[PDB]
Write a protein that binds this DNA or RNA. Structure first.
Ligand code: K
Ligand code: K
Ligand code: MG
Ligand code: MG
Ligand code: MG
Lengths: 148, 158, 98, 113, 216, 61, 59, 54
RNA sequence: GUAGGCUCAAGCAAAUCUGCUCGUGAGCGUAAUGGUAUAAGCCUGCCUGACUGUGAGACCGACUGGUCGAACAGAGACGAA
RNA sequence: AAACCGGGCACUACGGUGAGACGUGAAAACACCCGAUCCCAUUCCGACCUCGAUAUGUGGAAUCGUCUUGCGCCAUAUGUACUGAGAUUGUUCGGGAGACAUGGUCCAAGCCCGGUGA
């Protein structure tokens, strides 16, 4: 959580292996767990916590301006993707091997069919347009999913 | 032969059969054990604390690892201890508390002040906070325990 | 820049040396292990570092307990079981006499 | 804790097929010698038997268990079993009736393995 | 007494199509990909009585356009709580009808990325058979609710309820009336107005929807 | 106990539901307890008279 | 009960307020056993109220 | 560099000169070790007493 | 070392003993990993096999070398066995 | 004599392990109900174990039964993940989970001692 920017308070180990993320699907299909509408991914890749926070801020700021008054917080947002892999990096003007570099940020591994966001308590058109606004901040291809 | 358990078997068992709903004569509550444990702030070192426990219980205590002292009384020793405490109970109005299956009593120095056999050697029991006495009964219900204690607490006054 | 991590240890070569159905002669080491991953069964002895070895010439059979998941290794002897010498001295003498 | 299931003692070099198992109730005493490969009762002696429950007065105590042990030892020596191996259950120690049965068998003359 | 009571919903006659299938001769990803390339969804029809030894199964293939149309028109959950007629013939356009039977769609597999159907499962439900059916909920009366009038927001805890249903009276959906709920209260699974012959699998003290107060 | 159980079942309905109620009234504290000697006749009233003669008047503070 | 571990015991006599005799055991702290009589030493204490205190003076 | 332990000789009291080399700490004690151990030159168990290592 | 006995940690009820759930989560001097419940853990009694001379047969392997081990002879410890 | 019942050993997760409800002590068996003098038990205590005692009481604790069930366990799909060989820059042939779904908690069963039958 940590307010806006989401990463763990502490980890078991400081540095992790790179791993692979270009494959992986949900082998059983996907369904919404909390909300009526949602945004899911169609491809697999990496998303940074800054991008996830920017997408969440875009959705909540669209609801803020579309619906005011007592319905201003009637919209509920669930963020179902969490960034818990630190990435590292060596600065400029450094040679190749003297260990491993300092950590610079956090990423999340996203699979094909993973639900990134879930929305409830709003109109269908507001949910579709908030998904449209939020997908412009993510590098992956996303789809709007509806409960049925 | 002995007054307490004889009174239980001859009077209270029949009336406790008749007063409550029981499927068998082995479902009647009885009397298991008495557990005596001294009150919390005490010395662990002086011989008064050991002797003031050995004298009213009649058997050696256990001192576990020195932070805990305990005595458990079963059988005829438990009956003698109970018929002493119930006789000295008739000289005052000491409070007791009924739990789900057991009776709690507070063995203060004002109890051994009124015990006629402990009027002498009173300097043993002086400077002692007291004990906590537990009477465990084989009772399913707190009301069974209350009925059993009201049966056992008898006097000729009133 | 300096790392503090360059240490490892020499390999120990553990594992199962004789699998199921293998033919063993006495003295053969079956499983070398850290702790009793396999417990000794019939005609299988154990050393001070939980090494399992064979005592009779036969074939290695494994066993698993279904409830607890414990595992045992037995050796089926080649000629079958051998009775005690007190029985071979007394009861077999009377068996030949009867 | 969950008590794990008991195993028979491990085979080391020789078979030792005759196992002595004892049992005691409120009224009688029983002792059995079992042949392990066939899972049959090779020999038995108990104070519940028709030829034994009237020839002794008390059928439950240490003296009765000692008489039963002596009878079982003589039955084993005439059925030609020179040695037996003793099995002890979950609560039996070498004390009292168990001790009486074992010492009676040993004095009857059966080797103990 | 095996009929829908009055005051209850019934299955619609608009979506009462019959599902056409042809036999399939093998299992596996090879023949599954071949059928999907040819434009058919693999499927199996089975019964309850012998879970071991297969279950009198028959391997079939249904039409992708029909199945996708049914799922899109009904919804995913509504398709799974409604009975259908299945007609298995030897060939498309043939009249050699092998098996006509009244069956429940036990599950349908959708791709997690493209949402094309990959597998349909049918279980034989003639009258007199018992099923575990997951019934969707429909929430009505949200304009009459005093709590929603006062500006409170709606917390839908559960969307589907699992029941034990005889085949003849399986409800398509459960109507839940929100007319008389103000701020603070919730509805539990024991308040659902169902047939008396339906048994609730979940315990009755399970919340379904609560109206919680707004941020004053 | 068996005879009491047989006695409760030969009653009318409301009269039976009344008599199935458990008795929870505590035992009387004035009933005696058996011991090795019957009470002296001129003892208890004497002790009561002495106690009330002591409790007569008020103690000075 | 273990041996060589517990205190010795003694027999003493109790006399109830009605004169009933009862025999009990007790840890031996006297040379010979004695008879202890029980009285009515209940010692119940009462305090007067303020209206009672007022009426004790001004009437 | 500094060692916390030292070596000692348990010497056979039979006079044969057979010794065992044992080890004890240097933190501090006053009780000299003695044991009942096997002396192979006399084929009997005898008494062994600790002596300083030379 | 041996013989005998015992079974932890955590939660709940009573608010340190006694009972119920659970199951390795306690301990095993010392890092981590594997193991372990009539024990490899804890207690009590007695001891010094923390012996001497050998060792069928295997497991590691450039070599130097290292590990496990049934069994044989002498002297012993504990145990009714 | 051949069946049935009780006890001990043996076989075993479809045969395990918990929970609930209803029953059962056959002229027999098992256990409890009673005591702590000797053996034994307790770092205090007959609580546990042990040793004595019980023409007949009780199945309250355990033990036996019958059903309902929860975890497990067994059997089996359909589909997907993943993967061996092969380059139409993997258009071919094979293997096949986990989680779902469906059913079951079988069948067979040896030795000895005692009782009723006899
Ligand atoms: K020791
Ligand atoms: K030797
Ligand atoms: Mg296949
Ligand atoms: Mg031991
Ligand atoms: Mg599977």
């Amino acid at each position: 959580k940590k307010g806006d920017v989401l990463y763990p308070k502490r980890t078991k180990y400081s540095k992790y292996r790179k791993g692979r993320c270009s494959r992986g699907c949900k082998p059983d299909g996907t369904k919404l767990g909390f909300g009526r509408y949602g945004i899911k991914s169609c491809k697999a890749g990496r998303l940074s916590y800054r991008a996830i926070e920017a997408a969440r801020r875009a959705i909540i700021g669209h609801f803020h301006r579309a619906m005011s008054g007592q319905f201003r917080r009637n919209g509920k947002i669930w963020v179902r993707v969490f960034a818990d892999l630190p990435i590292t990096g060596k600065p400029t003007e450094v040679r190749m091997g003297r260990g491993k570099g300092n950590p610079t940020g956090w990423i999340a591994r996203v699979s094909t069919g993973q639900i990134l966001f879930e929305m409830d308590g709003v109109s269908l058109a507001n949910a579709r347009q908030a998904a449209t606004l939020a997908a412009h901040k993510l590098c992956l291809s996303t789809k709007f999913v509806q409960w049925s | 032969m002995f007054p307490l358990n004889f009174h239980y078997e001859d009077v209270l068992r029949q009336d406790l059969l008749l007063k409550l709903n029981y499927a068998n004569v082995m479902e009647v509550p009885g009397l298991c054990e008495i557990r005596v444990v001294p009150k919390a702030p005490y010395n662990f070192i002086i011989k008064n604390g050991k002797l003031a426990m050995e004298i009213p219980c009649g058997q050696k205590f256990i001192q576990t690892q020195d932070l805990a002292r305990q005595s458990t009384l079963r059988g005829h020793g438990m009956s003698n201890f109970l018929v002493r405490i119930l006789t000295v109970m008739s000289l005052l109005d000491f409070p007791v508390e009924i739990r789900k299956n057991s009776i709690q009593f507070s063995m203060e120095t004002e109890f051994c002040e009124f015990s006629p056999e402990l009027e002498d050697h009173f300097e043993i029991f002086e400077h002692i906070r007291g004990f906590n006495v537990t009477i465990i009964t084989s009772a399913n219900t707190q009301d069974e325990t209350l009925l059993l204690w009201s049966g056992f607490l008898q006097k000729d006054e009133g | 820049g300096s790392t503090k991590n360059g240490r490892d240890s020499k390999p120990k070569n553990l594992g199962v040396k004789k699998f199921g159905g293998e033919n063993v002669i006495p003295g053969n080491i079956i499983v070398r292990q850290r702790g009793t991953r396999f417990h000794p069964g019939d005609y299988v002895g154990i050393g001070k570092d939980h090494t399992l070895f064979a005592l009779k010439e036969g074939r290695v059979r494994f066993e698993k307990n279904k409830i607890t998941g414990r595992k045992w290794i037995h050796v089926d002897p080649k000629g079958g079981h051998v009775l005690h010498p007190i029985y071979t001295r007394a009861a077999a003498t009377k068996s030949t006499q009867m | 804790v969950i008590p794990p299931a008991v195993r028979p003692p491990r085979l080391f070099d020789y078979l030792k097929p005759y196992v002595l198992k004892m049992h005691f109730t409120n009224k009688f005493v029983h002792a059995q010698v079992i042949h392990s490969p066939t899972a049959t009762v090779a020999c038995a002696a108990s104070s519940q038997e028709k030829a034994l429950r009237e020839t002794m007065g008390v059928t439950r105590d240490v003296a009765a268990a000692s008489k039963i042990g002596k009878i079982l030892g003589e039955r084993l020596l005439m059925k030609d079993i020179p040695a037996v191996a003793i099995h002890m259950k979950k609560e039996q120690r070498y004390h009292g009736k168990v001790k009486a049965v074992i010492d009676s068998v040993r004095e009857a003359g059966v080797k103990l393995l | 007494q095996l009929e829908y009571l009055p005051g209850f919903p019934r299955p619609d006659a608009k979506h009462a199509e019959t599902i056409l299938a042809v036999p399939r001769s093998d299992s596996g990803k090879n023949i599954s990909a071949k059928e999907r390339k040819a434009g058919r969804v693999p499927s199996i029809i089975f019964e309850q009585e012998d879970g071991q030894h297969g279950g009198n199964k028959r391997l079939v293939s249904v039409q992708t356009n029909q199945i996708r149309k049914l799922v899109t028109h009904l919804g995913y959950s509504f398709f799974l709580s409604r009975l259908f007629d299945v007609e298995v013939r030897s060939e498309i356009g043939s009249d050699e009808v092998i098996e006509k039977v009244r069956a429940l769609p036990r599950s349908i597999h959708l791709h997690s990325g493209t949402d094309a159907p990959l597998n349909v499962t049918f279980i034989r439900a003639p009258p007199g058979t018992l099923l575990k059916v997951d019934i969707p909920l429909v929430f009505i009366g949200d304009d009459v609710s005093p709590g929603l009038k006062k500006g409170a927001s709606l917390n839908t805890i559960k969307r589907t309820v699992k029941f034990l249903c005889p085949a003849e009276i399986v409800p398509p959906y459960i109507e839940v009336d929100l007319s008389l709920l103000d701020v603070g209260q919730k509805l539990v699974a024991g308040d659902l107005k169902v047939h008396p012959a339906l048994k609730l699998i979940r315990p009755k003290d399970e919340p379904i929807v609560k109206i919680a107060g707004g941020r004053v | 106990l068996n005879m009491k159980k047989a006695a409760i079942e030969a009653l009318p309905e409301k009269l039976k539901m009344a008599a199935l109620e458990p008795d929870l009234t505590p035992f009387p504290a004035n009933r005696g307890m058996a011991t090795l000697t019957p009470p002296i006749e001129g003892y208890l009233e004497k002790v009561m008279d002495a106690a009330k003669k002591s409790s007569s008047k008020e103690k000075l503070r | 009960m273990k041996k060589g571990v517990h205190p010795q015991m003694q027999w003493i006599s109790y006399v109830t307020q009605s004169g009933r005799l009862m025999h009990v055991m007790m840890t031996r702290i006297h040379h010979v056993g004695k008879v202890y009589h029980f009285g009515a030493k209940r010692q119940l204490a009462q305090s007067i109220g303020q209206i009672a205190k007022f009426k004790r003076r001004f009437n | 560099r500094k060692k916390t332990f030292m070596f000692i000789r348990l010497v056979s009291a039979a006079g044969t000169g057979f010794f065992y080399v044992k080890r004890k700490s240097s933190k501090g004690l006053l009780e000299k070790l003695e044991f009942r151990k096997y002396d192979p030159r006399v084929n009997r168990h005898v008494l062994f007493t600790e002596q300083k290592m030379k």
